[PDB]
Structure formats: C-alpha cells, structure tokens
C-alpha cells in the first residue's frame, strides 16, 4: 500500500475524502406518467419563468430548503418534495419587489465595479465601461459566496487574445469549491481549442448555466483585461419572502396559464391567498383538468368550514376541484423540528398511483381516497387540537374532505369530494375525471382529422368515437345500467340526429362506474 490523497487533481489516482460526521444520501428516479404544476416561493431560481424539475434536479434547480425558523416560507418545497415522488412537473417562482441580482462591470483598464439591479430592469452600460457580467440564476450570493477569477491564456492561432474565466463557490466556514471554467475572447471572430466560438456573450449563453454578459459595442475593440484574484458579487439580496403581495401571485398564475407543456394536474403548493386560488381554479376548469387545493391547516374545526366558502371555488363553475384540511403536526424530514403543513401533493400522489394501474387509457375511474392509494407517510403525528371532534355531516354538506387512521396505523384520506353543491353524481371525484379524459381524447382526435382530404365529417366522427368508447369500456370505466328492464344493456349510446341539412348534432351518453363508500352491517340472534 501507499499514500492516499483527499481531493482529486489532474493526476490519475484514487482519493478518499475525510469522514463526515453528519450528511444525508438521497437517490432519485425519473418518470413522466402525469405532469403537475403550481407556484411557490423558493431560495434560488429564475423568477416568472416555467421551470421543469425532476427527482434529481429539485435540489440544484429550486434550492436548499428554507429553514422553518424563518416562518411561512418552508411549505412550498415540502409540497414539491411530496408530490415529486411519483412524477415530475413544472414550477413558476414568485419573488417580492425588493429583490435584486448582483452584477460586476469592467473598466477599459480592467478594474471591477459592483452594483445590483431589480429583476425587472435591464442592464444599461455607462460610457467608459467595456463589458459587464451578472448572474442569470435567481440566486443571491449572501450565504454561499461566489467569486470570479480572471487569468491569461495562450493567444489564438490567428493572433487573437484569449483569457480564462473561472467561477468558484465558498461557504461561510471557508471551504472553497470549483464550479465552472471557460476560455473567453473579447474579439468577435475567435475560436476555441475545440473549434467552438469564444465570443463572451455567445459562449456564456451557450455553455454556462450561471453567468451572462453584456458588452458595449462601441468601446469593445480597444479593451484590455489583466489578471485579477477572486472577486465576489455583492448587493444581491431577496426581500422578506414571508410577505408576498397578491400582484406577484397573480403574475405567476398568468405565467402558468400561457404554457404549452400540457400538464394533467394543478396544485396549490402552500399558497393561502384566495385570489390566487380562484385564478388557479379558473385555469383548472379551462383545460379540463383536475385540481387540488388546501385551506390553512392551523384553523380549528369550527373555522375551517367558513374558510371553504371564503374561496370562490364552491359553486357550479369549478367542478373537479378538491379542498383539504389537515390540522395535525409532524417531524420535518430535513430537520427534525416539528413543522406543520397541509395536504397538497399527497392527494395528487394518490391520484397518480391510481392512474398508473392501467396503461392503455390510464384508468381515471379510481378515486384518490382509500387505504391503499392514499397514505400519509410522516414521522410522528400529534393532533393540534385534541379532545375535539369534527361534525362529519356538516363537512359533507360543506364539501370538505377528511382524514382518518387506517387499519395498519398510518393516517389515511377517507373521502374524495369535488366543489359542486348540486346533487348531480358530480361531487364524486372520478365522475368528472372520466368525462374530462374522454373530452381530451376527442379533442386530440378531432385536431388530427382536420388535416384530411375531406375534413371534419359526421361519418368520420363516429368511427373514432366508437373505438375510443370501446377502449374505455374495456378498461372498466363504463358499466352496464343497473336495471336491465328499464334501460338497455349497452354501456354507452352514440347517436347522430339530422334535423335540417345545415345543423347536425353528435351526442354520446355514458354510465360511470360507482364507488363503495358507505357500508352497514346488521347483527341478528337466533
């Protein structure tokens, strides 16, 4: 045996880092069965843009979870972590107005100048300044310090001058790590050792995920750069993130609305603003999609019911939107600190588990509630308001869902109701879900056959619908009518009515599968 190094350099060897007394190892996996969406507040991230996060990116993208001691800023990341165990999704970040990002400007001689600007604003280069480098990622450099290093390199083959740009990260303790390195040339027409372009803005846009640059075209030609030691970004900060105005929330919701990624669920990740919830419900009803929302968990049983009516969801417009209430407490995963947060992303997990059962059409008839699909996996549960009992009938009248302890011992979601006051077989969760899935399939069918020599025709619209309805019958979503004498044995009836030549009409009826939720036993004695 021989010596063992602690860190790897450029030599060929095997290194072992010192033993770490405390650390956590996490393993992830990727799956794209169903796509969710939402809004929230996080540590770092490009604000007001759609971000795609998987199980292996939700730490790099987004950021390190915020400490619960800050208050009201930790819920969204916990909801995202709970929901991401099934499939990936999309997130839009909302940031307060008093938020700035750092930037360093360079003089013709090469000295740096530090400043910060609001996220909305655009960089304007003062006369006498050659170029500026700023941070594209919405990451303030307060607790982790980011330093920039410049040194010279060999000149280009065609006589152009190039230099090395390096980025480093330093913690509060003093541990220094290396993030990125680049070869950059100020000349417009320059090439890398690998043949790629070395123009600073183009290279930074292409092969860097942290930095961007803006140059002044007039004075770029007669510019000189000298070697500089580590220079740290300053002035980049995030305002108080516990106080977010409704305007930012509405802007994030509007950003979600105009997205082409075609997700299949919308989630309220710890957002307890009524206007934002109503906007999210409007988005949910627009796209023929399911939706899950949550009321504030700290409210008692008595105050929870009016809080459901406070949001505008309760009515006939917003069908297939569910509201949950969870006044319990649990130990946080990252730090065992006894945090409280609601149930959003646990219901979606149950729905995704139900959907994964069928592979042809998805099997949307499975209800989210149940002791098998829906389980709450948390460390230790302690009721916030013991010796208190909810009024179950009032909750049912109020379209509020409840939770209960299962046979195994873990907490279970025991009901699934949508926000529809009328008695239309629609307050059951799956009944709108089947019809929404069929409607989406029909829309995709009708979009495709428009590009046909004839176009949209009544004869063409019947064959495809018969095929799709037969597939849905095969999956078990549609069943024959209960009374065979009064109604026919067919599960669905598809017919076309003529009327006049100009006006046609295509209609199909369906008999949805039932759910078993109330059971009664009657003992007797011989």
């Amino acid at each position: 045996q021989y010596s063992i190094q602690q860190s790897l350099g450029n030599a060929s060897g095997v290194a072992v880092s010192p033993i770490n007394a405390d650390a956590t190892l996490s393993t992830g996996v990727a799956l794209n069965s169903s796509l969710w969406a939402g809004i929230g507040v996080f540590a770092r991230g490009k604000p007001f843009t759609v971000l795609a996060v998987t199980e292996s990116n939700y730490e790099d993208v987004l950021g390190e979870p915020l400490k619960p001691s800050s208050g009201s800023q930790f819920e969204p990341i916990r909801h995202v972590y709970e929901a991401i165990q099934q499939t990936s999704g999309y997130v839009v970040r909302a940031v307060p107005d008093d938020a700035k990002f750092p930037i360093i400007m360079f003089d013709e001689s090469g000295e740096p100048a530090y400043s910060a600007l609001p996220y909305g604003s655009e960089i304007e280069l003062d006369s006498g300044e050659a170029f500026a480098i700023y941070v594209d990622d919405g990451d303030p450099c307060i607790s982790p310090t980011r330093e920039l290093t410049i040194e010279t390199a060999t000149a280009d083959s065609a006589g152009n001058e190039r230099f090395l740009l390096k980025l480093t990260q330093t913690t509060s303790l003093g541990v220094v790590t290396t993030l990125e390195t680049h070869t950059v040339s100020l000349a417009e027409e320059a090439k890398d050792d690998m043949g790629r372009l070395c123009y600073l803005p183009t290279a930074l846009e292409a092969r860097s995920k942290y930095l961007r640059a803006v140059v002044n075209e007039e004075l770029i030609s007669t510019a000189k750069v000298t070697n500089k030691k580590s220079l740290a970004f300053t002035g980049g900060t995030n305002g108080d993130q516990s106080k977010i105005s409704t305007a930012a929330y509405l802007r994030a919701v509007k950003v979600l609305n105009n997205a082409p990624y075609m997700y299949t669920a919308v989630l309220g990740l710890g957002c307890y603003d009524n206007a934002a919830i109503t906007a999210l419900g409007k988005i949910c009803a627009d796209r023929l999609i399911d939706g899950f929302f949550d009321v504030k968990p700290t409210l008692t049983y008595a105050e929870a019911l009016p809080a459901v009516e406070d949001t505008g969801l309760l009515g006939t417009d917003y069908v297939s939107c569910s509201v949950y209430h969870y006044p319990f407490s649990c130990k946080d995963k990252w730090t065992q600190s006894r945090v409280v947060f609601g149930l959003s992303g646990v219901a979606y997990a149950a729905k995704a588990r139900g959907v994964k059962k069928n592979s042809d059409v998805g099997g949307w008839h499975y209800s989210p509630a149940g002791e098998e699909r829906a389980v709450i996996a948390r460390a230790s549960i302690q009721p916030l308001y013991p010796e208190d009992t909810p009024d179950e009938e009032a909750m049912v009248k109020g379209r509020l869902n409840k939770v209960s302890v299962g046979t195994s011992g873990q907490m279970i979601i025991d009901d699934a109701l949508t926000c529809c006051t009328q008695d239309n077989y629609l307050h059951f969760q799956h009944v709108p879900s089947l019809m929404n899935a069929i409607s989406r399939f029909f829309v995709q069918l009708a979009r495709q056959m428009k590009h046909s020599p004839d176009g949209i025709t009544a004869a063409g619209l019947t064959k495809g619908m018969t095929k799709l309805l037969d597939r849905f019958v095969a999956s078990g979503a549609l069943v024959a009518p209960r009374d065979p004498d009064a109604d026919g044995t067919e599960p669905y009836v598809l017919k076309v009515t003529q009327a006049e030549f100009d006006k046609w009409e295509v209609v199909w009826a369906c008999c949805p599968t039932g759910v078993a939720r109330r059971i009664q036993g009657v003992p007797l004695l011989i």
Binding site: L288, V319, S439, G455, A458, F501, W504
Partner: protein, 53 residues
C-alpha cells in the same frame, strides 16, 4: 367548460355540402390531333450533321 346540468358542449364545426345539378360538360378530342402533330416535330429537332455531302 360550458356545462349545463350533466351535459358538456365540446365544439362547433363548419361543414360544406354539395348538391348536384343534372348538367354536364365534357372536352373534345379535336385538339389531340394538333398536339400530336406538334409533338412529332421534336424528333427532327436537336439533330445535326457534322460534314455536308
């Protein structure tokens, strides 16, 4: 989502229908002779003789 009672309204399309009339029109075979006469000439074109005799 236009939803009334338990029924949805999904889409409305525009369709065009054709109703025939008894009238008919057909072409004449008179121009085919002229077309053939013109086409025959391209055989003799693009032909050259190197030396006169």
């Amino acid at each position: 989502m236009i939803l009334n009672n338990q029924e949805w309204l999904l889409a409305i399309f525009k369709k065009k229908g054709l109703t025939p009339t008894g009238k008919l029109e057909f072409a004449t075979i008179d121009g085919i002779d002229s077309a053939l006469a013109q086409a025959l000439n391209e055989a003799f074109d693009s032909q050259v003789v190197s030396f006169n005799d």
